Amino acid sequence: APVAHLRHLLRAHSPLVHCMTNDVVQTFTANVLLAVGASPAMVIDPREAAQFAAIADALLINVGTLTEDRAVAMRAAVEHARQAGKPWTLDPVAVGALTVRTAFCHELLALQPAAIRGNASEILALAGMAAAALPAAQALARRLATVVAVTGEVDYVTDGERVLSVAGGNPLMTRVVGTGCALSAVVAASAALPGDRLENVAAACGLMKQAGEIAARQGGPGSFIPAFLDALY
Amino acid sequence: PVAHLRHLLRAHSPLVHCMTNDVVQTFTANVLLAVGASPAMVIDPREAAQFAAIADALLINVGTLTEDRAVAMRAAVEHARQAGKPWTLDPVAVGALTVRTAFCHELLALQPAAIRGNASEILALAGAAAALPAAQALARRLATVVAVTGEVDYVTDGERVLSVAGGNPLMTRVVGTGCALSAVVAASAALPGDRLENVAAACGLMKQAGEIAARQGGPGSFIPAFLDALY
Amino acid sequence: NPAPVAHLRHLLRAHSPLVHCMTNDVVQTFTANVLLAVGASPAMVIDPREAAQFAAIADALLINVGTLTEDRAVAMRAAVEHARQAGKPWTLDPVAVGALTVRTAFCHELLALQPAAIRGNASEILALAGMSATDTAAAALPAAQALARRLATVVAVTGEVDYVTDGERVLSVAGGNPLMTRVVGTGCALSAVVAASAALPGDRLENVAAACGLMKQAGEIAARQGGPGSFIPAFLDALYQE
């Protein structure tokens, strides 16, 4: 609705998601993906990654703790997923603020991500230009024929033309690490599913904010994490 | 035998050198602490060589393998062997991924005390009920204990075969429950007793914990309750 | 004495210090969540160029050598150099120094680069200063003092009781609970909060000691669950609690 509908697609198709994400959020990413019914796989050697990105239903690239070696493996994965027809998702963590990852993400955009999930500043850096980032998101989306999700208190999602917004959640989500990085992994899995991509991405945003509102009622960030996983399951 | 293994882990507090994948490291350390053991994670090739000779047991889990890590793991296994310390292999996604499979095949030459893997993994390592014949032949060939883990775990020394049932399917909806089992299997090879029986007891300890923790119903609440159940 | 602790609590939330965390593989997530729960902002940046860049920006820098590697050591050095040039305080957590060679040598290299604070257990501070050997930390108190003077640092040598010294003065903190030792990362997370604390206004020594006390009080509250599993979420909650 389409949140309940997305819940059902995830459980029914159980997408296998190649996660190349950052060291702070890996465990939580895997647990989130398992809780919604998907299957996480973390593969990071350049050769293994190339091999696996062709096999997995979808690929997540998150640059939060980028290093030289991991960039090479990530570029390889992206190239083989693209050659295999597998959708890949970019999370441009702190792009705009740190040079190496900024340059790297500009290079990766050539290779046609199915979705880009970031905050206002990240999306502006990449567009070459959440709500004040909206013209940029639309520009970026049109340029790449991709879906862009610019996230915050309200999430905005666009394909260049249509814009959906998704309100809800709770401030507590920001005092716990890896909820946005986990949203990116759910968005990435959602690209592998049938239906309208824009609408599935807005649904993934809704799913995570609904779980977060439930888990936030506990009141503390420690208790939030178990409650959040429980509420996704 | 489960309660006896529980007691022995606490009384010996085995120092376990964990060379495990990035996703399960924290959980592995916290499981080992909860059962009364002592986890240490050492990954520099030189530090790992030094430390492997000192630790009571070594775990090698190839889940997020890289070439650098591979040379550090090779060096750790070689120094453990010469120090007479038992090491355990967890061949994650062997069969699935080429580089990994080649590396694990190379490590078999170095005589692990125990191998812990799923059906597919053990089938691949050896060249399910399907995996039982293969496990028995692997165990025979290397004189190791092989544990094929699943809804029911099977453990073999190549002659006898023990089954361990119980647990809860929810354990599969939480990452690193298998990886953590391998660490407790690694610790248990440092303990006195029959190695086959100690490994089977380790499987039972983790299933018993899991049955208690899954009662809450959800995979988020499972983790604190699992750790609490082990302590 | 508990006054500074309560004050440190409000100051961390008010200043929300941005801490560049170069810490070990096993404790990343928990360090980040602890720094978030106390009202700070963690950032894990590890590429050598990026780390140089970010260390100049951050309010403080934490160096924890727990899973040291050769490549990471290069980035940690770059970071420390740029934090020093920018006048941002940096903190050293010498995990397992003495007991492992490579990182012991590396730590001694870094000691010349003038850390604001050092945080270790008895054996690590002993080995770090170069002094042979219910209250494990007391015995390294002589080693702390000497290191604090030689480098004009603050040294926190932690245990069931924590001792914090600038070489002349010594403050002691107690409480907590031994269950804290049956959970991984509580040490390394304390170092992060110490790193945050060095960036706040006021007396540096007293702020480090206050950090040790904040964590001891949270742990006491979290521990009366009995179990190490329930401890973690209760610990974070307690730190968040106003």
Q: What is the CATH number of the domain that holds A72?
A: 3.40.1190.20
Q: What are phi and psi of C36, to 5 degrees?
A: -65, -45
Please check whether residue A23 touches C, CB under 8 A: yes
Report the residue from A101, A178, A222 with minimal CB separation from C235: A222
CA distance C87 to C152: 15
Total count of domains within chain C: 1
CA distance C178 to C176: 7
Residues on chain A touching B220 (C-beta within 8 angstroms): 31, 35, 225-231, 233
Q: Positive or negative CA dihedral for B150, B152, B155, B161?
A: negative
Taking the mean position of all CA atoms in its chain, how far away is CA B159?
21
B60 min Cα distance to partner chain A (Å): 16
**Which residue of chain B is at minimal alpha-carbon distance from A30?**
B175
Helix (H, G, I), strand (E, B) or coil at C48: helix
CB atoms within 10 A of CB B80: 27
User: For residue C207, what is the enclosing H or E element?
Assistant: helix C204-223
**Residue of B27, B26, B35 lying closest to B6 (CA atoms):** B35
Q: Which residues pair with C61 in a beta bridge?
A: C20, C90
User: CB distance B47–C229 less than 8 Å?
Assistant: no
Report the residue from A22, A99, A226 with minimal CB separation from C50: A99
**Which residue of chain C is at minimal alpha-carbon distance from A71?**
C47
**Residue of B165, B50, B185, B67 lying closest to B115 (CA atoms):** B185
Please check whether residue C105 touches B, CB under 8 A: no
A90 min Cα distance to partner chain C (Å): 18
- C-beta contacts of A227-230 below 8 A and 24+ residues apart: A227/B220, A227/B221, A228/A179, A228/B220, A229/A31, A229/A32, A229/A35, A229/B218, A229/B219, A229/B220, A230/B217, A230/B218, A230/B219, A230/B220, A230/B221
**Which residue of chain A is at minimal alpha-carbon distance from B175?**
A31
Residue B84 tokens read as 């007479």
Q: What are phi and psi of B152, to 5 degrees?
A: -120, 135
| CB-defined contacts B:C, below 8 A | 74
**∠ Cα C176 C190 C28 (to 5°):** 125
| CB-defined contacts A:B, below 8 A | 76
Residues on chain C touching A94 (C-beta within 8 angstroms): 43
Q: Is C193 in contact with C34 (CB distance < 8 Å)?
A: yes
**Which residue of chain B is at minimal alpha-carbon distance from C31?**
B26
Q: Is A165 in contact with A132 (CB distance < 8 Å)?
A: no
CA distance B27 to B36: 14
Report the residue from B41, B44, B231 with minimal CB separation from C228: B231
Taking the mean position of all CA atoms in its chain, how far away is CA A15?
14
User: CB distance A26–B26 less than 8 Å?
Assistant: no
Give residues 60 to 79 of C whose Cβ lies within 8 Å of B: 66-70
Residue A129 tokens read as 């230009």
User: CB distance A44–B63 less than 8 Å?
Assistant: no
Q: How far is CA C99 from CA A144, B47, C55, in A?
A: 53, 10, 29
Place of tokens 């609408």: A199
What Rg, from alpha-carbon coordinates, does chain B have? 16
Report the residue from A26, A225, A228 with minimal CB separation from B23: A26
**Which residue of chain A is at minimal alpha-carbon distance from C232?**
A222
**Residue of C194, C14, C142, B216 lying closest to A233 (CA atoms):** B216
C68 min Cα distance to partner chain B (Å): 6
**Which residue of chain A is at minimal alpha-carbon distance from B102?**
A48
Strands B145-148 and B153-156: antiparallel
User: CB distance B219–A69 less than 8 Å?
Assistant: no
User: CB distance C46–A65 less than 8 Å?
Assistant: yes
CA distance C91 to C97: 15
**Residue of A50, A75, A84, A66 lying closest to B99 (CA atoms):** A50
Residues on chain B touching A47 (C-beta within 8 angstroms): 98-99
Q: What are phi and psi of C80, to 5 degrees?
A: -60, -40
B157 min Cα distance to partner chain A (Å): 31
Report the residue from C29, C236, C240 with minimal CB separation from A28: C29
User: CB distance B231–C233 less than 8 Å?
Assistant: no
User: CB distance C236–A221 less than 8 Å?
Assistant: yes
Place of tokens 């742990």: C219
User: CB distance A222–C240 less than 8 Å?
Assistant: yes
Place of tokens 């690490």: A177
Residues preceding gaps in chain A (C to N > 2.5 Å) = 129
- Written as one letter, the residue type at B195 is R
User: CB distance C46–A28 less than 8 Å?
Assistant: no
Angle separating helix axes C204-223 and C228-240, nearest 10 degrees: 130
Taking the mean position of all CA atoms in its chain, how far away is CA C174?
17
Report the residue from A26, A41, A48 with minimal CB separation from B99: A48
CA distance B100 to A7: 34
As a whole number of angstroms, the longest Cα–Cα distance in chain B is: 46
User: CB distance B64–A42 less than 8 Å?
Assistant: yes
**Residue of A179, A152, A183 lying closest to C33 (CA atoms):** A179
Report the residue from A41, A44, A226 with minimal CB separation from B66: A44
**∠ Cα A77 A79 A83 (to 5°):** 115
Indicate the DSSP class of residue C185.
T
Give residues 24 to 53 of A whose Cβ lies within 8 Å of B: 26-27, 30-31, 34-35, 40-45, 47-48, 51-52
How crowded is the C-beta side of A67, counted as CA atoms within 13 Å?
14
Q: How far is CA C108 from CA A180, B171, C70, C94, C195, in A?
A: 39, 45, 15, 10, 19
Residues on chain C touching B46 (C-beta within 8 angstroms): 101-102
Interface probe for C, chosen from B23, B30, B50 (most Cβ of C below 10 Å), is B30
Q: Is B119 in contact with B128 (CB distance < 8 Å)?
A: yes
**Residue B184 belongs to what domain range?**
1-231
Place of tokens 């609970």: C177
User: CB distance A221–C54 less than 8 Å?
Assistant: no
User: CB distance A66–C49 less than 8 Å?
Assistant: no
**Residue of B51, B90, B71, B64 lying closest to B177 (CA atoms):** B90
What Rg, from alpha-carbon coordinates, does chain C have? 16
Residues on chain C touching A69 (C-beta within 8 angstroms): 71
Which residues neighbour A188 within 8 Å (Cβ) at sequence distance 6 or greater?
Answer: A17, A19, A58, A59, A60, A87, A88, A89, A115
Helix (H, G, I), strand (E, B) or coil at C124: helix
User: CB distance B218–A226 less than 8 Å?
Assistant: yes
CA distance A205 to A168: 10
Strands (E), chain A: 16-20, 39-41, 58-62, 88-91, 115-118, 147-150, 155-158, 163-166
Report the residue from C33, C50, C54 with minimal CB separation from A221: C33
Burial class (CB in 10 A: 0-12, 13-18, 19+), C222: buried
**Residue of A181, A175, A189 lying closest to A64 (CA atoms):** A181
Q: Is A64 in contact with A35 (CB distance < 8 Å)?
A: no
Q: Positive or negative CA dihedral for A201, A205, A206, A210?
A: positive
Taking the mean position of all CA atoms in its chain, how far away is CA C70?
22
Q: Positive or negative CA dihedral for C170, C176, C181, C183?
A: negative
